[PDB]
Write a protein that binds this ligand. Structure first.
Ligand SMILES: NC(=O)c1ccc[n+]([C@@H]2O[C@H](COP(=O)([O-])OP(=O)(O)OC[C@H]3O[C@@H](n4cnc5c(N)ncnc54)[C@H](OP(=O)(O)O)[C@@H]3O)[C@@H](O)[C@H]2O)c1
Ligand SMILES: NC(=O)c1ccc[n+]([C@@H]2O[C@H](COP(=O)([O-])OP(=O)(O)OC[C@H]3O[C@@H](n4cnc5c(N)ncnc54)[C@H](OP(=O)(O)O)[C@@H]3O)[C@@H](O)[C@H]2O)c1
Ligand SMILES: O=C(O)c1cc(/N=N/c2ccc(S(=O)(=O)Nc3ccccn3)cc2)ccc1O
Ligand SMILES: O=C(O)c1cc(/N=N/c2ccc(S(=O)(=O)Nc3ccccn3)cc2)ccc1O
Lengths: 207, 206
């Protein structure tokens, strides 16, 4: 028996999402993904249990993805596009509404460690994306759901270790986390309540 | 010039609720225009007068503005993604009512997007921003004493009364708590120094 077994992953086709999905399938989760029509999961990769094709900006599609889950992981982003956007915050608004309507409480959602910085220290090139992370975090904090705010520093390509530091409610001692370790942490947050209502900063020294 | 009686439009919104609470605690005699009274809190500070109606209805606006010393505007649209004229049409009704009743002072919130390049606006916020621009022009062209408040991201941090106000430009911080923003709206009732200017309240919260 698995207490948390059915999960929705938003952003499963992305850099962190692909390894989070692979790790979740290996760990025995029954994974539902929401994918945009033109960007499905790769053919040879791990297969989720359920695929909804649609858009996080459509409440109906988010409702179809959240229905019947035990928990939600959010790895939405805009790839290498740094333009002004609201896809993460509006997506989170739809996810919150769906979770409430469907009785799902646990949401583990990735924004960024810039939400623990002096705002004057965010690089201007990243300020438009960070502004939407700030909007998204406010939506999730005000929802009343069991929300783990994951606020990573630079996401790298180093290995899965499971040995990273998790700093609560502040910046940690390294400035990198591998995408594989970030995905491992998102899944770890499904199985404990200790991070609920906190900000978390995962980081590691790869050596 | 002393302001005692104010109307607040948008009193049931996130900034409106704390502006209303702060105004009642400070002694203002507050009139609000609300579409649904159940959205006002049952406990604690309550306004002195409640008009049930719509800012799009000139007669409801007229009933709200009658007898006031000043008007605070904290209108906004919920989730409008595409062209909308609620705020600017509301502002037209507010202006007409202020002129008809001899009310000379209006402090109105739009957004700091009006202080930055238009390409900084997220596409899905373009329509609300376009109507903020229309509302701002309505208020500037009215000849009324108008303080334009153009806040950045509105946060949930506790009131500080310690924020910065930048005049006709942007300040060095990118968030204002809804509570500090409401405190600033009220401060604008106690002075003429911001009239005819754009104002950018911002602060660093821890
Ligand atoms: N160093 C870093 O790169 C760094 C550091 C800290 C924080 N962050 C933030 O961490 C988060 C995760 O980053 P990442 O690099 O893993 O993500 P990513 O590679 O940018 O992937 C973004 C995911 O979101 C999906 N998506 C975007 N718009 C969508 C929409 N309208 N509807 C449904 N799905 C949508 C994308 O799907 P498609 O396949 O359809 O595009 C993709 O699966 C991002 O928010 C990022 O800003 C990144
Ligand atoms: N969210 C941000 O960070 C941010 C940042 C900068 C600027 N702004 C802008 O700041 C202003 C205040 O924002 P806010 O978040 O505090 O507002 P909000 O929570 O969205 O509240 C909007 C207020 O306007 C009222 N309203 C809407 N349509 C009305 C109508 N036809 N007649 C009468 N009242 C009506 C609403 O009444 P109901 O309760 O009846 O709906 C509510 O009281 C907005 O114009 C917003 O666009 C927001
Ligand atoms: O595309 C990107 O490169 C991108 C990057 C993003 N964030 N990158 C970050 C965010 C935070 C950091 S950080 O490592 O410098 N934070 C720190 C710094 C010092 C001490 C502790 N923590 C480093 C990189 C956020 C969105 C993005 O799109
Ligand atoms: O820096 C910011 O985050 C910033 C944010 C601002 N946000 N303004 C708004 C205005 C309206 C809303 S809304 O929730 O009611 N409607 C919406 C929300 C998203 C997309 C389309 N419509 C949401 C945000 C406005 C100016 C800013 O500088």
């Amino acid at each position: 028996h698995m207490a948390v077994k059915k999960i929705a992953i938003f952003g499963a086709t992305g850099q962190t999402g692909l390894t989070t999905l692979a790790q979740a399938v290996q760990a025995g989760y029954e994974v539902t993904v929401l994918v945009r029509d033109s960007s499905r999961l790769p053919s040879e990769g791990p297969r989720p249990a359920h695929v909804v094709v649609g858009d996080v900006l459509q409440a109906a599609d988010v409702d179809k993805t959240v229905a019947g889950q035990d928990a939600v992981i959010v790895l939405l982003g805009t790839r290498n596009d740094l333009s002004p956007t609201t896809v993460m915050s509006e997506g989170a608004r739809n996810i919150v509404a769906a979770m409430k309507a469907h009785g799902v409480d646990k949401v583990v959602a990735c924004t960024s460690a810039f939400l623990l910085w002096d705002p004057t220290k965010v690089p201007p090139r990243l300020q438009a994306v960070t502004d939407d992370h700030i909007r998204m975090h406010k939506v999730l904090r005000e929802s009343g759901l069991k929300y783990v705010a994951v606020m990573p520093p630079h996401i790298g390509d180093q290995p899965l270790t499971g040995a990273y530091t998790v700093t609560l409610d502040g910046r940690g001692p390294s400035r990198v986390i591998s995408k594989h370790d970030l995905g491992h942490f998102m899944l770890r947050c499904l199985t404990t309540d200790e991070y609920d209502g906190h900000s978390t900063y995962p980081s590691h020294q790869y050596q």
